[PDB]
Amino acid sequence: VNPTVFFDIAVDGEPLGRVSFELFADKVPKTAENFRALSTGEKGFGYKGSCFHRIIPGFMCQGGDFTRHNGTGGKSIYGEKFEDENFILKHTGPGILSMANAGPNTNGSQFFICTAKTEWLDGKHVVFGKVKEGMNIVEAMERFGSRNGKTSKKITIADCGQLE
């Protein structure tokens, strides 16, 4: 019953590959539904065409700012920001999907995929999904990142949607 969404990733316009995500909708229903709807675009806006603006190898890939493309924008399907739903799930290793924010109850549309266990984020960032297929594609994304997060080529979500 947990939805699966996909991102087709492109590097400077060239296809790289596909990553799919299970959204733990049974445990964070409000958070998961935000991500799911932004991935299908069914509300009239969402992730298609947006970039991954911050990638730090051995740490995480961050994306989801589809309005300013640099970490300062984005919005949720609920409004400009929504609450921290719960912290049932922890940052247990690579492939965890977690919400970016700017302090308590400031979720929007930015998220990050962890490429390392990041336990110091537990109880601060809402975990809501996990890579199901294509962890190898995320590891490939990582090699375009840098220590300060700037990427060496443009990493975009060329297409996205729901698989099940």
Curated annotation (Swiss-Prot):
Organism: Homo sapiens
GO annotation, cellular component aspect: cytoplasm; cytosol; extracellular exosome; extracellular region; extracellular space; ficolin-1-rich granule lumen; focal adhesion; membrane
Subunit structure: Interacts with protein phosphatase PPP3CA/calcineurin A. Interacts with PRPF19 isoform 2 (via N-terminus). Interacts with isoform 2 of BSG/CD147. Interacts with FOXO1; the interaction promotes FOXO1 dephosphorylation, nuclear accumulation and transcriptional activity. Interacts with integrin ITGA2B:ITGB3; the interaction is ROS and peptidyl-prolyl cis-trans isomerase (PPIase) activity-dependent and is increased in the presence of thrombin. Interacts with MAP3K5.
Post-translational modification summary for this protein: Acetylation at Lys-124 markedly inhibits catalysis of cis to trans isomerization and stabilizes cis rather than trans forms of the HIV-1 capsid. PPIA acetylation also antagonizes the immunosuppressive effects of cyclosporine by inhibiting the sequential steps of cyclosporine binding and calcineurin inhibition. Acetylation at Lys-124 favors its interaction with TARDBP.
Gene3D superfamilies the UniProt entry points to: Cyclophilin-like
Key words, A-Z: Acetylation, Apoptosis, Cytoplasm, Glycoprotein, Host-virus interaction, Isomerase, Isopeptide bond, Nucleus, Phosphoprotein, Rotamase, Secreted, Ubl conjugation
Name the UniProt record assigns to this protein: Peptidyl-prolyl cis-trans isomerase A
Effect of K124Q: Acetylation-mimetic mutant; no effect on its interaction with TARDBP
Every PPIase cyclophilin-type domain range: 6-162
